């Protein structure tokens, strides 16, 4: 029951980034995987989510178009292809697992109890 993120770095406006979240203890059949960003001074903001059983993917109103959530065919590695990076994207990015059997609401300002497992986070910085 662990998630570890990597792939975060320092980029210029318009650059690209590929974040990966490796899981141990469960596959993506019984959990919905999510990306949540914490910008400095802001509260936690939900980025994206993927239903691995289905073909249903969710995006926050802003991100959509440049950011793409994906999973492997082994159903235990979570990806977020981030392109055309803007400088307000700069945040710590966490992978999170929600039990799919729970209430399927997606709060945009979640707390710790909105997901089962949170990762350690990976820093994404967009600097000129």
């Amino acid at each position: 029951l662990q998630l570890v993120e990597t792939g975060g770095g320092l980029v210029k406006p318009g650059g690209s980034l590929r974040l990966s979240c490796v899981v141990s203890g469960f596959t993506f059949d019984d959990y919905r995987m999510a990306w949540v960003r914490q910008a400095p001074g802001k509260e936690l903001e939900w980025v994206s989510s993927i239903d691995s059983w289905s073909i249903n993917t969710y995006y926050e109103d802003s991100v959509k178009g440049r950011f793409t959530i994906s999973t492997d065919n082994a159903k235990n590695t979570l990806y977020l292809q981030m392109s055309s990076l803007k400088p307000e994207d700069t945040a710590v990015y966490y992978c999170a697992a929600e039990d799919r059997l729970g209430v399927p609401t997606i709060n945009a300002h979640p707390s710790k109890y909105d997901y089962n497992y949170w990762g350690q986070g990976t820093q994404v910085t967009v600097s000129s």
């Binding site: 039990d99 059997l101 729970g102 209430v103 399927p104 609401t105 109890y113 909105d114 997901y115 089962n116």
Partner: peptide
């Protein structure tokens, strides 16, 4: 919801035909 016991109105409209 996730790992915590909650109160949800969602059930009101999904009491019969849903996975959850």
């Amino acid at each position: 919801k996730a790992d915590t016991v909650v109160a949800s109105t969602w059930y009101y409209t999904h009491m019969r035909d849903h996975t959850n």
